[PDB]
Amino acid sequence: EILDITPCSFGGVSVITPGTNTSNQVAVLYQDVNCTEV
Amino acid sequence: KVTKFNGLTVLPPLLTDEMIAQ
Ligand SMILES: *[C@@H]1O[C@H](CO)[C@@H](O)[C@H](O)[C@H]1NC(C)=O
């Protein structure tokens, strides 16, 4: 049988954060992926 | 009229085509 091989979920990770003089709350952005493997 | 998994990606533009049309 023939099995297609695909490199599994990968992508970039960006952190959205305001200035350090305001708050330390952050948001993670996983690029070009679905919200399933994360 | 106008016409992968190796670490190379393309990021979508901030302004979508709908916003450019608007
Ligand atoms: C992510 O996976 C879900 C479940 O299969 C699907 O409903 C959704 O459309 C997918 N989103 C993208 C962007 O592929």
Side-chain angles (χ1 to χ4, degrees):
Chain A
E1 66 179 2
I2 304 313
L3 306 176
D4 266 322
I5 174 65
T6 298
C8 66
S9 168
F10 77 98
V13 171
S14 186
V15 192
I16 307 170
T17 316
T20 56
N21 54 331
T22 300
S23 179
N24 44 15
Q25 188 178 12
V26 309
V28 287
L29 172 68
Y30 303 90
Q31 301 172 359
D32 202 9
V33 298
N34 196 333
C35 300
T36 56
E37 285 80 16
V38 180
Chain B
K1 283 293 184 179
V2 54
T3 72
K4 291 176 71 69
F5 299 145
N6 290 318
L8 62 90
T9 68
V10 59
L11 301 191
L14 178 64
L15 282 80
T16 67
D17 292 331
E18 167 183 347
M19 295 179 185
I20 309 296
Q22 289 193 14

